Amino acid sequence: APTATLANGDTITGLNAIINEAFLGIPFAEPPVGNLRFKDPVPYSGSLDGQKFTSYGPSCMQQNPEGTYEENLPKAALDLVMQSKVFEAVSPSSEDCLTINVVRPPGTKAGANLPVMLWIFGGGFEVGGTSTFPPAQMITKSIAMGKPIIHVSVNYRVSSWGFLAGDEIKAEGSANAGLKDQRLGMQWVADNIAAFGGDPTKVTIFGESAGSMSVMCHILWNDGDNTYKGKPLFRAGIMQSGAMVPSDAVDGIYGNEIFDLLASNAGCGSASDKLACLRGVSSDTLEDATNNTPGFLAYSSLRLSYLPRPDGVNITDDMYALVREGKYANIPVIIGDQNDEGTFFGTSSLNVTTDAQAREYFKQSFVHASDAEIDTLMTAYPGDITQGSPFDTGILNALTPQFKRISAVLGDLGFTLARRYFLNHYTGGTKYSFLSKQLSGLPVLGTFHSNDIVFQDYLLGSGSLIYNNAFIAFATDLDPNTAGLLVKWPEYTSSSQSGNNLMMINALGLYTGKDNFRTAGYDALFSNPPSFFV
Ligand SMILES: *[C@@H]1O[C@H](CO)[C@@H](O[C@@H]2O[C@H](CO)[C@@H](O)[C@H](O)[C@H]2NC(C)=O)[C@H](O)[C@H]1NC(C)=O
Ligand SMILES: *[P@@](=O)(CCCCCC)O[C@@H]1C[C@H](C)CC[C@H]1C(C)C
Numbered sequence: 423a424p425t426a427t428l429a430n431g432d433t434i435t436g437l438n439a440i441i442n443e444a445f446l447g448i449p450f451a452e453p454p455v456g457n458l459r460f461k462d463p464v465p466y467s468g469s470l471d472g473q474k475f476t477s478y479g480p481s482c483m484q485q486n487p488e489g490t491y492e493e494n495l496p497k498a499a500l501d502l503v504m505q506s507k508v509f510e511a512v513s514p515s516s517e518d519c520l521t522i523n524v525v526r527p528p529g530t531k532a533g534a535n536l537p538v539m540l541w542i543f544g545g546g547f548e549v550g551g552t553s554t555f556p557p558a559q560m561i562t563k564s565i566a567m568g569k570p571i572i573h574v575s576v577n578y579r580v581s582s583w584g585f586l587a588g589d590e591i592k593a594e595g596s597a598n599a600g601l602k603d604q605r606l607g608m609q610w611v612a613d614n615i616a617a618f619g620g621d622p623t624k625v626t627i628f629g630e631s632a633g634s635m636s637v638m639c640h641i642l643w644n645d646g647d648n649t650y651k652g653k654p655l656f657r658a659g660i661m662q663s664g665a666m667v668p669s670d671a672v673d674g675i676y677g678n679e680i681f682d683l684l685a686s687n688a689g690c691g692s693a694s695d696k697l698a699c700l701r702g703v704s705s706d707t708l709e710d711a712t713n714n715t716p717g718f719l720a721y722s723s724l725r726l727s728y729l730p731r732p733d734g735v736n737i738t739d740d741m742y743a744l745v746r747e748g749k750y751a752n753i754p755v756i757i758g759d760q761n762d763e764g765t766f767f768g769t770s771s772l773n774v775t776t777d778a779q780a781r782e783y784f785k786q787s788f789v790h791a792s793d794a795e796i797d798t799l800m801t802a803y804p805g806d807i808t809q810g811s812p813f814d815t816g817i818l819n820a821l822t823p824q825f826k827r828i829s830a831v832l833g834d835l836g837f838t839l840a841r842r843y844f845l846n847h848y849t850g851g852t853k854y855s856f857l858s859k860q861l862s863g864l865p866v867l868g869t870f871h872s873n874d875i876v877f878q879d880y881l882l883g884s885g886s887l888i889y890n891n892a893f894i895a896f897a898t899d900l901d902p903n904t905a906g907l908l909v910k911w912p913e914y915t916s917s918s919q920s921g922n923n924l925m926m927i928n929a930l931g932l933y934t935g936k937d938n939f940r941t942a943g944y945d946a947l948f949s950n951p952p953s954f955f956v
């Protein structure tokens with residue numbers, strides 16, 4: 423029933439879901455299989471003429487979150503679940519996974535010129551797919567608001583398949599393949615979105631967690647040049663939890679170790695060209711070898727095995743430096759956080775209970791940090807359980823004497839204070855920032871990492887006012903205030919500015935506040951950012 427005519431003249435059919443029209447599973451690239459593994463995506467050249475696109479394709483290969491070279495119960499358990507026929511039926515994954523999904527309000531026709539919201543999912547750069555992020559809530563609210571938008575989502579390679587690094591990967595020019603998948607999807611939207619009723623000049627990119635750090639990377643891509651065929655690929659960005667990635671170069675120390683580990687795992691330790699050896703192994707051996715490297719929930723936690731790393735080609739340098747040096751695209755941005763970003767990651771080191779163990783955990787995580795810097799950090803984030811995350815809970819959530827401590831640190835470096843650093847240095851366009859405390863009181867996790875996905879795609883709550891409405895007004899008008907909320911969202915100029923600069927959210931609704939908390943942690947972490955890179 424729904425129909426579109428692509429740039430190359432092909433004409434496809436979608437599905438009419440009543441409350442919206444969807445075109446799911448459109449291939450935007452050749453399958454990154456065989457000798458195309460770990461390499462840049464190749465544009466799709468073939469025919470889609472007369473084809474039906476009524477369901478999401480398989481996600482790219484997934485990594486066991488509890489994977490690691492060690493053997494243990496959670497690793498065993500998740501593997502048991504992940505390799506099950508039931509799981510593989512309900513959630514199919516494949517190396518041939520580079521597809522794109524377009525969903526629009528019902529009745530939309532070519533030429534409508536609706537603003538476009540291109541979603542980039544977050545899954546710790548190791549798991550994830552588009553099928554788990556329902557656009558219906560967004561789309562519907564946009565219609566109700568009288569600001570209809572088109573929701574676009576793109577699959578990208580994760581874990582070893584999309585973020586392998588090391589000397590060989592650098593030499594070949596194959597770094598950050600997963601980010602390149604994302605970049606091609608954008609180019610595809612530029613060329614084809616008009617056929618669906620969207621305006622290619624009104625694209626707002628947005629993601630959460632890894633999707634968010636992805637949006638930052640796109641702003642920094644090619645020293646800030648975001649054009650394609652002479653026109654910008656997007657006019658704005660919304661980052662939900664995540665700014666710059668605190669990572670060393672692709673041919674760095676941990677990028678090289680992981681590469682080597684993965685190679686030994688696949689049986690390529692003796693190969694003179696391990697990379698070629700890796701392209702030759704079956705998908706099973708590769709999937710297996712990857713699950714034997716640390717997953718995000720493993721003890722390594724935030725020190726991810728796979729993630730965006732400066733390559734000196736498309737991301738020319740340390741991401742913090744690029745921001746200080748003004749090498750970014752000049753676009754208006756909304757960037758916010760959840761009050762308790764680190765409680766999730768803090769669950770991965772619950773066998774650390776004494777300050778002596780805490781100091782060593784940090785030392786193993788941040789190899790570039792001197793004992794002096796470790797000491798300063800452990801002074802800014804003290805053992806006092808009342809001072810940690812879940813913030814403001816007193817002596818509760820004391821799973822261990824160090825849990826709340828470790829959570830306060832990880833969530834700040836990885837997201838919360840990382841954001842403030844971007845904000846204090848960024849002059850590309852108007853900035854807007856928010857902080858959620860919607861789930862205050864939730865035992866153990868607090869207003870935890872990713873709860874925004876729930877209030878943006880699944881359930882309604884005070885938070886949906888920002889996650890849907892405000893995000894919609896911004897994509898349409900480049901100002902979240904056009905949404906018509908009762909609380910005006912003030913512009914963010916600096917964390918040292920007088921007056922409220924953050925939009926806040928609690929169980930009841932919205933209010934304004936200041937971005938001046940944990941200043942001591944900020945200087946401990948960012949006085950010399952590279953001391954804390956992974
Ligand atoms: C907490 O548990 C981790 C995970 O097992 C311990 O780290 C591993 O320890 C073994 C030896 O027991 C090493 O061979 C592994 O390489 C370690 N894994 C990692 C990912 O580093 C860690 O020592 C324990 N921490 C505390 C404070 O007891
Ligand atoms: P993000 O993708 C975590 C990014 C880690 C950065 C370290 C430098 O968070 C995920 C988001 C999804 C929706 C749910 C799980 C959550 C984590 C991977 C635990």
Ligand SMILES: *[C@@H]1O[C@H](CO)[C@@H](O)[C@H](O)[C@H]1NC(C)=O
Pocket residue numbers: 602605644735736
């Ligand atoms: C990466 O950088 C090179 C050199 O600047 C450029 O030609 C290439 O197009 C860039 N890649 C992407 C995906 O933009």
Ligand SMILES: [Ca+2]
Pocket residue numbers: 588589678681682
């Ligand atoms: Ca090596």
Ligand SMILES: [Ca+2]
Pocket residue numbers: 646747748749750
């Ligand atoms: Ca500039």
